[PDB]
Each structure stands twice: as C-alpha cells, then as structure tokens.
Design a protein around this nucleic acid. Structure first.
Ligand SMILES: Nc1ncnc2c1ncn2[C@@H]1O[C@H](COP(=O)(O)OP(=O)(O)O)[C@@H](O)[C@H]1O
Ligand SMILES: [Mg+2]
Lengths: 95, 93, 520, 107, 86, 98, 87, 93, 107
DNA sequence: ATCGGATGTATATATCTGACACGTGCCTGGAGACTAGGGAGTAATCCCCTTGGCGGTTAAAACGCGGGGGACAGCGCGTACGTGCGTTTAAGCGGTGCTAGAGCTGTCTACGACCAATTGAGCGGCCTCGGCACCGGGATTCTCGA
DNA sequence: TCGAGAATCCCGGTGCCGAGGCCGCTCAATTGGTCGTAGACAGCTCTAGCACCGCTTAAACGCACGTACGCGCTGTCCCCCGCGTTTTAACCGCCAAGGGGATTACTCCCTAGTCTCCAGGCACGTGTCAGATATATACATCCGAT
C-alpha cells in the first residue's frame, strides 16, 4: 500500500503531461443536447461543434481548479472545498 | 462649436417616468456615455452578425439578434417587445 | 455713541439698498462736466444701455457750496503736528468727499499716508459728526501698524483687528461686529474674502484699501467680493498705480467710480491706439482723481541712485546649453533665463558626481565672474551689498559661492519663517554686524523690510515688471539712507535678457509718461 | 407634403434619423435597412427609461428631487440585470454600495 | 430526432472525471462536497455558451449548430478558442 | 479615567462614513505629481489636462477600492480579520493580473 | 554645498498611509497590517504605468503633446475598464 | 467552395525558420486561427484609431500605432522594426 | 510588362494583395492606404515566425519532427510576451504546463 | 541503511495514416489609364497649461504612548478522505441505412443609395429662481464601564 | 446588570449657483424621383447527422480499513488601534509670459478608387512514403516497511 498522497501526486504528474480529454464523450454530448432542448426544439449538432464545446468547458474547469487550489493553500490547507470554489469564482467576477 | 448629444432626448424620457424630477449635468454626461456605449455594442454585434452570414445590409433582424445576444435575461425580452412594437407602428404608418 | 443707535444705522436698514441713486449721479456728472468736457465720451458709451443715465446727462447739459475748508494749521484733535504736504493731502481728501467723488492717494512709500488717512477719518468723525462704520483692508503684515497709528494720533476711536483663528473671529464678530460696538475695522485680504457674509450686511461709510495695486485684475476674487459690498464712498492707497499696463489703471478707476469708468474699451482706445502727443494732453481726464508726491522735493536727505547696466557674454558651457535649449524637462522660454543666470541650475551641467565647491563655480558663469570681481572690489571699500534674484535656487548657488569665499550672509526668501526673517534683518542691521551680503528674492517681505545700512544693490536678474525691481531698489533707497545707493543690473549680452530688459523699459516709459509726468 | 419625423411616425422620443446617420457613417455595413434605426432607437429608449426610473426612485428615497451620479450608481448596482450589463463600467463620482461583512460586526 | 426527452444527464459527469480535471489542475485532496458544486458551475457555463450558439444558429435560419457558431459564442463571451476554424 | 472607545468600534464607524460618501480619498496635488512623474519615462515634455488627471484619479481609486474588497474576502476566507500582502497577492493572482 | 537638490522624498510616498486607510475603509476592511501600504503603493504604480503608457500612445499618434481626458478614457476602455462621466 | 487558408504562407515561413521540421494539420489550423485573430485585432484597433482622429483612410501610421497598443514590449519593438523595414523596401522599388 | 507581386516587391512571404483585399472588404475604413497592407503583412509574418521558432525548439526538445498543438501551447505558455498576448485564448488539444505547488510535495 | 516491489523510461520492430509533392484551371491580383476628394499646409482668434516664484489658512499627517485583542503556535482527536479490490456497465468502435437540410444556381423584384430642394428640430447663448449645501441647537441613539 | 457621554440625525434658517426655460438660426432630416443590384424564393443535389445494432473491455461503483488532516481549544506575545499634540503641506489666491490646440476657413495636389484585360498563383484533387503510434522488454529509479 502506498501512503496517502503518493498516488495523487503521480496522478497530477500523469495528467499534467497528457493532452487528452478527461470527460467521457457520450455523457457530455447527451448533456449538451439536454441543455439545448430548452432553447429550441429539434436541434442538430455538428460533431465538431460538440468537440469544441467539450474543449472549452474542460479548459474552463481546469483553470478554475487551479484557482481553487490556490485559495485552499491560502487558508493553510491542502483540501479544496466548495467555499474555495465560491471564493475563486467570486473574485474572478463570475458570481 | 456644435457638439451633438442625447441630452434633450434623455430629458424627454425622464419627464415621462418621473414628471417632477430633475437631473444634474454630471448625471447627464453619464447618461450620454451610457447611450453611446450601448449603441456601439449593439451596432458592433450587428456588424459582426452581418459579416458572418455574408450580408451587406444591417436590418432589424440583425439588431434584434444583437439585442438578444447582449442584453441579459429579462431586459432582452422587454427590449425586443419595444423594438417590435415600434417597427410595426412605423411600417403601418 | 451707544451700540443701539450703531445697530440701527450700521446694519442694512433695507433688504436691498443697492439701486440707482439719481441725486448722487447727477451731482457726479455735474462736477465732472464742470471740470472738463472729456468725460462725455464715457457717458455716451455707457448710455448705450441705460437711458436714465443719458437723461441725467441731457438734463444737466440743457441747464447751461464747496466750502474751502482747506484744514490748514494741522487739525487740533490729531495729536501733534504734521508736515504741510500732509495738510494738502487731507484738504484734497476733504474736497473729494464734499464733491461726492473718490480718488487714489498715490504718495511715494514712506511719505506717510496712514496718518493722512486717519486724519481724514478724524475730520469725518469730528468736523462732520459722522462716526463709523469704516472698513480698512490692508496686507496682513501691516494690521498692527494701522492699529497703533490709529491709537496714536486719534486715540478716542474704536478699532479692532478682525484677525484670529476661526473661533476667535466668530466670537469677535458676535461681540463687536453684529453688536455694533466699533468705529473702524482692520482686516486683511484673506479675512475679507473669508468673512464675506458677516461683513456684507453693513452699511459702510468708507472702504479704505492700503496697497490698492493688489486690486488691479478686476477678475480677481477680491475684486468680485469687494463689488458685492455696499458702501457710500471708497478710497485707494497705493504708491504704484499703473505697474505694467493701462488696463490696470482702468480697473482701479472702475472700482473707485463704477459709473464713470464703466467701459475698459473706452480707456484703451483713449491712448493705446500728434499721434501720441495731443492724446497725452487728454490725461487731464485723470487729473482730479490722482494725487501723487515724489520724495525728492519734499524730503531731501536721500541722495539719488546711479544705475549701471553691466553687460556680460555667455561662457562656454553657457553657450553649449543655450544652443541645446534653442534648437531641439525643458518646457518654457524661462529655461533660456535659467541658462543666462547659471548653467548649474540644470541638473548634470555641474561637472561630475563628487561635487566640490571650487573655482569652477564662478568660472562656469559670466555673471558670477563679474559679480565675484565686483564683490572683491567693493569688499575693499567695506560697502555692504544686497543681492536680488527672481529665482531662489540661484540664491542657493550664490550662498554656496559666498561661503566658499568666506563672506557673511543672511537669506530671506519665501521659505524662511517670519520670526527668523525679523531675526536676520536685525542681525544684518546691527550697528556692528559682520555680515557682508544679504541674499534676497526680489518679490519677498512685502514693504516692511528696511535694509538702510547697506548701500550697494545688485539686481542679479531683471524682472518683467519694472516696478518689482524698483521696490527692490527702494529696500535700500528708503528714507534714512545717509550714504549713496549704488545699483548694478547684470545683463547677459545677445540673449533673451536683452528682450526682457527692453520690454521692462517700454513699461517703465509708459508709467513715466502717463502717471509720473504731471503728478506735480 | 408636410414633413413628419420618423420618430413621431414610430411613436418614439429618440432620434431615428440621427441613429440612421450614425449607422450609415459608422463603418458597420455597406447598407442600412429602413427598420434598423427604428428598432435601435426603441431599444435605446427602453434602456434609458429603465435606468432613469430606478435612479429617480433612489433620488426620492434620499429625499431629493434631482438625479446625481450617486443615484445612478445606487440604481445600477441594486438591480441584477443592469449590474450584469454594466459590470465593467465605473461611474465617476458614484461611490459604492454600503456593505459590511457580518464577521466584522461586534459580538 | 423524434420524441426524445433526456433527464439527469448532469450525473453523467462522473466523480472520477471531476477528479481527473482536478488532478490536471494540480489538486491533491478533494472534499466530498466538491462534485455537486462542480456540476453546478459546469451546467451554468454550458447554459450560457449554448444559449449564445443557438441564438447565432437561429439568426442564420439554420437547424444545425456548427462549430463556428460555438466559436463565435465563446469569442463573444471572452474565451477565444483556436483550432475549429476562425 | 477619560472615556475611550474599544478597538474596532471606530473602524466600523469609519467604514460606514466612507461607504456613505462619494468624494475622492487621495489628495489631488500628490496624485498629480505622481502621474506627472510616471509619464516622464514614456515621453519627456508632456502636458496634461485637468480632466485627464481627474479621470486618472477616479479610475485609480475605483480600482483600489475593488482590490480592497477582494482582499478583505481573502482575509476572511483565511479565518482572519486583518488584511495582508499575501491576501493582496492572492487577489491579484486570481484576477489574472499576476 | 546646498546648491544640490537633497530634497523631494519619493512621489509614491505622497500616497500617505491615512489615504490608503480611507480607501481600505471604503473597501470595507477593519484591521490593516503594517506592510499593506508598500504593497498598495506598488500596485498603484503598476496600474498607472499601464494606463499612462496607452494614453501617451494615443496622444502621440494624434500628433499632440497634451494628454486629454479622451485619451485617458480610450486607454481605460482598451484595458477593459470603461469610465462614464468624462465624455 | 475554395476557402482561403494562410496555410501555404505559414509553411513558407516555417521552412525557413526551421528548414527540416514539419507541422501537423491541427497545428496548422491553430496557426491559421492565430493569424486571423491577430489580423482582426490589429485592424479593429486601427479602424477605431482612424475614427477617433476623424480620418477616412487607414495608413501605415495607424497600423504602427495599433501594433504598439496591442503588443507587449519587445514584441512591439521588433514588429515595428520589421514593418518599417518592409515598407521602406517596398516604397523604394 | 511582366507582373511582379507586391509581396515579392516588399521582400515578404505573406500575401500583400490578399491582406489589402481583406482590409478593403472588412468594413474597417472608407479608404485603405498603399503601405498599410505591407506593414500589416510584415507584422503578421514576424509574429508567425516568432511563435514557430519556439514551437520548433519545443518539438526538438521532445525529439519530434512535426509541430503539434502541444508544442504550440508549450511555446506560448513558456514565453512571457506570447503568454500575455494570448492570455484569454484556449489552444485545443494543448494542455497545461507541468506545475505543482511546493506545499503539496512530501516533506 | 537496506531490501522488495511497483512505476516510469528508454530501446527495438512493425503498421499505417497523414503530411508532402505533383498536376489543372480559374479567378484574383497586377498593369495601365483617368479622376476627384481627402488630407496637408497656411493663416487668425481665443482659451488653457507650464515654470518659477510669493503669501496665508488650516486641517491632515506624523509621532508617541498605552494597552487590548488578535495572530500564531502548539496540542489533541475523531472523522473523512485516500488507497485498493472485486463487480457491473456503458462507452467506444465498427458498420448500416435513411433522410433531412445545407449549400449552390438562376430570376427577378423591391428596396436601399443617391441627388436636388425645402424647412423645421436642435444647438448655442442668456437669464433667473428654486434645490441643495452649510450652519447652529437640540433630541436620540448607542457604547462603555458599573 | 443603569446612568455618563459622545456621535448622529433631524430640524429650521440662509445663500448661491446651476437647471431649466426662452429665442434665433442653420443645417441636417424629409420628400419626391431614378436606378441598379442584393436577397428572397423556387428547385436540385448530395452530404453528413441521426438512429440503430452488436461486441469488448476499461472505467465507474460500492465497500473496507486506517491514517493524517481539519478543526476546536488554550496560551502568549506583539502589533495595531484609539487618542492627544505638533507641524507641515495641501489649498487657495496671485504674477508674468508664451506656446499648444481647438476652431474656421481656404488652396491644391497627389493618392486612393474605378474600370478593363489578362496572366500566374493558389485551391483542389491525386498519389506516395516516413514519422508517429502500438507492442514487448529489460533497466533504473523512488517508495515504503524492517
Ligand atoms: N509726526 C509725524 N508726522 C508725519 N509722519 C509721521 C509722524 N510720525 C511718524 N510718521 C510716519 O508716518 C508713516 C506712516 O506712513 P507709511 O509708513 O508710509 O505707510 P505706507 O507704507 O502704507 O504708506 C510712518 O512710516 C512714520 O514714519
Ligand atoms: Mg504701507
């Protein structure tokens, strides 16, 4: 057994070195269609359109988690919390 | 020496919602800046919209779509209603 | 009197007493037209708006006891006696009052004008049985002198200075002003501007202004504030009317009598544009309003001064910096005047970072070379010297030079506080003082400074306004100078300093031709 | 015939003709339709009326009858829609909304 | 595209996917309440972007949403994206 | 014993006083000197307009007040009530300015 | 040796500590650490340098030597901070 | 049909900055988007500049000022140098 | 009268005629000067070469011949001027810079 | 400190697929006239900004002191996260068919541009009188030490 | 846990200045009439988006065990706040001169736009190989427990 944090650090190094997409594709496609059906019914999507949506959303989430990590460290902590997320995207101006 | 501004029209609008209320010159300048900024935003979005679809004309359709893109939520619905009412009245006259 | 009657009469008996007084303006125009027929132009120019003044004019024209109370044998009520020309000035003031016109007392500094003014006020209170209120606006430095003079020659009057902190001023206002327990008020320019409201609500019998040339830009806030005041008559005391312009004289006159000299365009078109001979003779338009005396036919013991212009040529670094400025931090024509004084006034012109006060100081500036040679020469005779400059940084440089050559100085610029100002003046003016030079900015200290011990003045840097330099000379030419004053203006040859000198000479010629010619 | 302004023909207060001129001379497109100035003037009028009603309410709350930049800021920052539309705008001489964090209060 | 209504698809953004995103962000420990907050923020962001993209596709009188519509929506929201045209 | 307020109760009063007003909080002459010195490194011999300096001051103070609000939020997040340079740095780093 | 400047403490020090305290009070902060003032002065200097650089670029493109309120407003809008009230 | 790309010019520049390297299709698309983005940014700033100064034409002075506004520091310096060099070489021919 | 492109006449690689046409048909101004396309093309070519050399250096660092979006991202993010120019830009199939806060590393 | 595992990390070989080179043609950039209007240079007027001085008032700013309360460190503890292991499951991939709708072509109106003539709307200038700022003074509230 | 007492709010009185209101004029909106070309509409076609279906296999899920970390509590300084006393710098008012910059005309020239032909340059469609995956395979190199 590895002590807690070792596998997490190896995972950080693994995912900060790759470039792939970290969310599954079919679940995200279903999500965007379900969201879109609240604006106009019987809508069709280009595969490129869904791919661009996934890239943008994943970049947004990764860049948000960096700020959340900074907020958690600022409070002498290593665990990120919903209050950290709220502080991050309240300082950014998305509140 | 002639500098055009929206002050006269803003005062006409003010005397309709608050018939007994005045306005200072600083608030007038802020209102003029606000009107110019909103005009620029809507016109720029409409220009981009016409360019995206390979159109040479800016029409009320482009203005409506730009308003829906820029204004948030409840403001956009009422703005679209007012614009549509004005266009229908004008084209009927 | 009693505070009740003074409350009844001093305060504004009506809400708006400022209106068109027909009798006063009729008498004014009558006396003016009796004096001469030049003022018809002013009356016609002002008649283009109000037909009441025009109807007064034509009524007076179609109809076509000045008691000679010369007040000779100086007033008994005034303590002691005063000189005959002071009697003549008091008589002039009385004649001005009885003829319902104002004027400008323009005796030269030191002749004594406060005594004449307070004697005139004593005449009013005693021979005309009319006490105050009387407003007296003076520079802040002279309020105590005014109070002492009033308490000295006519002691039996009420005179309180309106000076003090805000709370003290308020309590003084309530105790005396609104209580109407006074006769004469002494106030400063800043006090008049500040305590405007409690002072407007008084029916003033007179507004005396010492050093009235201060009120010469009729757009200055003091002018606007003084216009709102309500008074019966006004008086101006100043030794330098028409400093550098005819418009300024018109502004003084417009304050004095705003109905006569109501148009500045008229006064400018009067002379500004033979061609300049007969129009000069038309200066009788100002003959009854101005009285000026010269301290040469009255006094005597003050030998006159001799002025020499010492021309110098720029040094090598001065030439370099002059060219660098001329063809191209540096944001004005004054940079040319800094270079003509000393190149060290620009940062970096002084050689090297580990600065040493040595001969390069005098070496690098030609004005300083000539000044050093002349200073040594005068030090042979033991004469004491005053240095004047438009700039105080140049006074710093001169301070360093003077210390480097082991001379004893004392500085008075705008920075030095008033107490140490008096201290330095006393040190220099000690009967056995060992101080040699007195560094001094030209426009500093007002008029209270009295450096009579010195007898040599150098104007290291001339001024746009010739009257400022004339006052600077007067700091040593003041009454009591038993020696002979010797003045030296340093002029940089073939530079902008010649242009400044030419403009100042034009202005001085204007003053001499207009006011100083027929002053008698 | 008799001239009638397009503003009056559309029942507006804002200048349809001036909006048309600015649209034509602003390098926005090669041509400008007939209804675009009318629509844009109507929208501008609506937004102006909205913000002015809120500002007048604020002025009357402060027991004054004259709108000032403080009242404009109070109107804008207290409404979520206008606060979103004007998020990156700073109103000169406007001040801030009074707001103290509850952790900072006594006891 | 006929008679299709979807629900609860936000739960398809699984907890391991959120954990991978956090790891690429450089996060070592994750609180158990972080996943619902993440789902909320993702849904809000996606709603805004899709609203603008659908507005563009409606103006073009189309029924298909294109990658260029998505790119225009992102660019107007201030999140310029390279690699899908433009 | 002369009357004395306990620490914090005057700070809260000042907070209310300054959040109720609208005037500028920095002195005009020092601010003008600062901007005139800063502009000297981009182009010497520059003139300014009074309205230009006023606009600079309004923008600067709005920026600083917003930054202090964010800094206060960071300080409260860290379970403190005193704001610190680390809080300022965190606020500017999250906003994207550093 | 006084002909040298030896004067004029730095212009950033003209943003006195009471002024920063007033700004903090308007921001709603209660206790201010002693090291906040230097940090605030640095932040303000950086912001001013950016804005003034852009404004000077505008005015020198226009071929003037006077920075105007319009140049400042354009610079601010270009940074992304629109300012209402100066035209 | 017949969409323009910038791809061949980007490849020409690449084959002289790094004569023996290649480039992937997705990377080339990213490069095309970068070129178009910078073009529209500079052109928009230049248009706004000309409108501010009440001019009708866009000239190399506007392009230079837009470059100075948009680029940071050393990038702006070197880009200005290259643009001026190209303009002089073109005019003297 | 053999033709000679202005792109070759200026010594550039990017097209000057195409840039001129895009400026002329992009609704930027009523008129377009003669040297504006040349200046703009020179600037665009400079920026392209600037980013491309850094991307090629990164590709050589990873021992690869072709340039991929990962190399473009690495170049842009590791160069500070380019990172400030492309601050609000997402590069698809790019990634993140390897970076771990030091507090997280084991003692 | 040393040893036993588990995890990258080079190293060699086989595939394939996507990048690069080559050929067509067509449409767009270039050469060459011709023209008009945008912008540069000139001149006059008036108002604002700079520089280096002065004088004065008066709040803010700076400094020192005391003391209180908040920061920071240390300690304990008790959950709640991480790690790892079976176990489903549903995502990804490949292949197929179907049809909606995106994109292109051709016609031809209807609607925008443009021009000339006319005239009302809006801008600048001038004047005044209420709204708001300021100042005592007096009641009210809130803090603090009992 | 009730008085001191200090700060704040709420009243009247001034007073002053800027917001509104009126008048003249001029210049941009409006009206009427060509004209030409964008876009609106109808028709076609072919592509790519959608709907399935089957199969494999990683990835997600649920559960357990147990550290280590987040949180609460307790002291301890020490640093920041509240307050009083100086003192000093901002803030008005001034002086001088001169240039910068905004208007408002004018003159004029040269550099753009607008056409007409007409070749080359570039986009598109192909046909290869070599660089980049995929698998194994052995090595070295951290990590964690004795
Ligand atoms: N007995 C006297 N008779 C005349 N003048 C006197 C007498 N005693 C003193 N003086 C002078 O009167 C002068 C007051 O006038 P002055 O100082 O010239 O005032 P200002 O400078 O305002 O003109 C004093 O300087 C003083 O020397
Ligand atoms: Mg005197």
């Amino acid at each position: 057994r590895y002590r807690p944090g070792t596998v997490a650090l190896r995972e950080i190094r693994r995912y900060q070195k790759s470039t792939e997409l970290l969310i599954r594709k079919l679940p995200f496609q279903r999500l965007v269609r379900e969201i879109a059906q609240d604006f106009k019914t019987d809508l069709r999507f280009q595969s490129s359109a869904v791919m661009a949506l996934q890239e943008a959303s994943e970049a947004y989430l990764v860049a948000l988690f960096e700020d959340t990590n900074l907020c958690a460290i600022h409070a002498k902590r290593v665990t990120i919390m919903p209050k950290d997320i709220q502080l991050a995207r309240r300082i950014r101006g998305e509140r | 020496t002639r500098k055009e501004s929206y002050a006269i029209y803003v005062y006409k609008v003010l005397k309709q919602v608050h018939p007994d209320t005045g306005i200072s010159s600083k608030a007038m300048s802020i209102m003029n800046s606000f009107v110019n900024d909103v005009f620029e935003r809507i016109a720029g979005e409409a220009s981009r919209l016409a360019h995206y679809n390979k159109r040479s004309t800016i029409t009320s359709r482009e203005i409506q779509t730009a308003v829906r893109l820029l204004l948030p939520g409840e403001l956009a619905k009422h703005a679209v209603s007012e614009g549509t009412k004005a266009v229908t009245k004008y084209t009927s006259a | 009197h009693d505070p009740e009657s003074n409350k009844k009469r001093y305060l504004l008996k009506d809400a708006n007493g400022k209106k068109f007084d027909l009798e006063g303006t009729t008498k004014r125009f009558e006396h003016l037209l009796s004096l001469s027929g030049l003022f018809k132009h002013f009356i016609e120019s002002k008649a283009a708006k109000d037909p009441k003044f025009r109807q007064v004019l034509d009524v007076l024209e179609e109809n076509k006891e000045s008691i000679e109370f010369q007040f000779r044998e100086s007033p008994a009520y005034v303590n002691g006696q005063l000189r005959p020309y002071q009697i003549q000035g008091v008589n002039w003031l009385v004649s001005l009052h009885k003829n319902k016109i104002a004027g400008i007392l323009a005796d030269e500094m030191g002749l004594g004008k406060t005594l004449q003014t307070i004697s005139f006020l004593g005449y009013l209170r005693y021979i005309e049985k009319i006490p105050g209120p009387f407003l007296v606006i003076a520079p802040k430095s002279t309020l105590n002198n005014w109070l002492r003079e009033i308490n000295r020659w006519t002691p039996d009057v009420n005179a309180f200075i309106l000076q003090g902190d805000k709370e003290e001023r308020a309590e003084l206002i309530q105790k005396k002003l609104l209580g109407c327990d006074f006769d004469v008020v002494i106030a400063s320019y800043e006090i008049i501007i500040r305590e405007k409201s409690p002072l407007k609500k008084i029916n003033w019998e007179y507004i005396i202004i010492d050093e009235a040339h201060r009120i010469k830009n009729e757009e200055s806030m003091l002018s606007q504030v003084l216009r709102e005041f309500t008074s019966r008559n006004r008086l101006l005391i100043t030794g330098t009317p028409l400093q550098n312009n005819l418009h300024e004289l018109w502004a003084l006159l417009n304050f004095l009598l705003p109905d006569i000299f109501s148009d500045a365009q008229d006064f400018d078109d009067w002379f500004s544009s033979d061609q300049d001979k007969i129009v000069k003779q038309l200066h009788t338009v100002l003959q009854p309003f101005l009285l000026r005396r010269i301290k040469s036919d009255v006094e005597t013991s003050l030998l006159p001064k001799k002025e020499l212009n010492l021309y110098v040529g720029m040094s090598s670094m001065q030439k370099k910096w002059y060219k660098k400025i001329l063809e191209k931090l540096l944001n004005i024509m004054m940079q040319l005047r800094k270079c003509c004084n000393h190149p060290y006034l620009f940062d970096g012109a002084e050689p090297g970072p580990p600065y040493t006060t040595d001969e390069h100081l005098v070496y690098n500036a030609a004005k300083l070379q000539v000044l050093d040679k002349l200073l040594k020469k005068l030090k042979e005779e033991g004469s004491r010297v005053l240095i004047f400059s438009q700039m105080s940084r140049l006074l710093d440089i001169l301070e360093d030079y003077c210390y480097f050559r082991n001379y004893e100085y004392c500085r008075i610029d705008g920075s030095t506080a008033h107490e140490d100002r008096i201290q330095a003046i006393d040190d220099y003016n000690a009967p056995d003082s060992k101080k040699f030079v007195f560094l001094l900015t030209t426009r500093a200290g007002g008029l209270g400074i009295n450096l009579t011990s010195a007898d040599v003045v150098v104007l290291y840097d001339s001024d746009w306004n010739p009257q400022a330099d004339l006052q600077a000379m007067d700091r040593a030419h003041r009454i009591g100078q038993k020696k002979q004053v010797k003045v030296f203006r340093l002029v940089t040859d073939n530079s902008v300093e010649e242009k400044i000198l030419e403009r100042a000479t034009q202005k001085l010629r204007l003053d001499q031709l207009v006011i100083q010619q027929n002053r008698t | 015939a008799k001239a009638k302004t397009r503003s009056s023909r559309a029942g507006l207060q804002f200048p349809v003709g001036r909006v048309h001129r600015l649209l034509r001379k602003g390098n926005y497109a090669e041509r400008v339709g007939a209804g675009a100035p009318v629509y844009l003037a109507a929208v501008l009028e609506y937004l102006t009326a909205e913000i002015l009603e809120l500002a007048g309410n604020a002025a009357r709350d402060n027991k004054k009858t004259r709108i000032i930049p403080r009242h404009l800021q109070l109107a804008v920052r207290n409404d979520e829609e206008l606060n979103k539309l004007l998020g990156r705008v700073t109103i000169a001489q406007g001040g801030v909304l009074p707001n103290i964090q509850s952790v900072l209060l006594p006891k | 595209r006929h008679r299709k209504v979807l629900r609860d698809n936000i739960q398809g953004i699984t907890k391991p996917a959120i954990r991978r995103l956090a790891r690429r962000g450089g996060v070592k420990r994750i609180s158990g309440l972080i996943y619902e907050e993440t789902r909320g923020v993702l849904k809000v962001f996606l709603e805004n972007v899709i609203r603008d993209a659908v507005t563009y596709t409606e103006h073009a009188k189309r029924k298909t949403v294109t990658a260029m519509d998505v790119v225009y929506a992102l660019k107007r929201q201030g999140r310029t994206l390279y690699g899908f045209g433009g």
